[PDB]
Amino acid sequence: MSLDEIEDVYHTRPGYRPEEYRWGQGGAKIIDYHIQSAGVDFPPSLTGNQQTDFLMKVVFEYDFDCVVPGILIKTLDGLFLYGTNSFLASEGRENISVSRGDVRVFKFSLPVDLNSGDYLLSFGISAGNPQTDMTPLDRRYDSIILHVTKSMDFWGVIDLKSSFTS
Amino acid sequence: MSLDEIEDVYHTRPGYRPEEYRWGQGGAKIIDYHIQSAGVDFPPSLTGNQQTDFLMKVVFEYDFDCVVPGILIKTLDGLFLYGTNSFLASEGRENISVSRGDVRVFKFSLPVDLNSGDYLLSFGISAGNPQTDMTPLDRRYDSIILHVTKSMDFWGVIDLKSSFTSY
Ligand SMILES: [Cl-]
Ligand SMILES: [Cl-]
Ligand SMILES: [Cl-]
Ligand code: NA
Ligand code: NA
Ligand code: NA
Ligand code: NA
Ligand code: NA
User: Fold this and answer.
1) What is the architecture of the domain spanning B9-159?
2) Which family would the database say this protein is a member of (chain A) (predicted)?
């Protein structure tokens, strides 16, 4: 993805769902995304035991002292499996600040240790100030379909990777 | 857990559920269990993301060439979160034979990568060829309640442990 482009091309990417429910109060726009794993841009399926990167590109229309990107994964039938954001997932505790006109890319990296099936991915962006509050600016809910093909043998929705000893 | 004791004391342990559904063909009995995490025996809850040991003790009434212990973890509303057995968890490494009268302990160790809340654990013992022909011997289904604690919950039920960076 290019930081010098601000066109909303999100809808053009592999896995995009026209069934997305987009909402938000405005002031920033999630204008693109990228998914990659094991050297492949937009792999047709994801799998466990390797990293996948989930990238979102945002253009900000105002200065904000604090911006918080987030991700959500649901089952195809709508069960919330896993959601996180920069406040929960970052090692550091510093606010991400932006200036009017800034274009930023946010990257969530995780091993997709889910059982085989289809899952729904969402990206969101919130912003605000410590002395006021945080507000959802753009939320692209259930906007990307993920096909998972497991690479380990396990049962249930998540591979907890147990060891075994006798 | 003592290998020289064969009394079925499973029902006396912390977290045991009288609501268990125990089933099986017989030939072995899961007679005890133990849970430990960070060196603490039977902690009142499991910390999210922390390695926890789940141990089961079995007495075998017959010789078996290939015994296969297993576990299941589910939510209260029946969502199947994770299951495995000795064969799957070890990627085919483990093959366990026993003689009549033997008492064995089996341990599954895993990071409890779950959100705060209550979960249902099962311990089972089966025998045979795991892929194609396995006889369930004693299956203690939804027999233990687990409590998971965290400081800050994420959204949902399973922790995929994402990292984060910005550009
Ligand atoms: Cl192992
Ligand atoms: Cl191994
Ligand atoms: Cl069972
Ligand atoms: Na709306
Ligand atoms: Na979603
Ligand atoms: Na596993
Ligand atoms: Na029965
Ligand atoms: Na997490």
Assistant:
1) Distorted Sandwich (2.70)
2) Belongs to the ABC transporter superfamily.
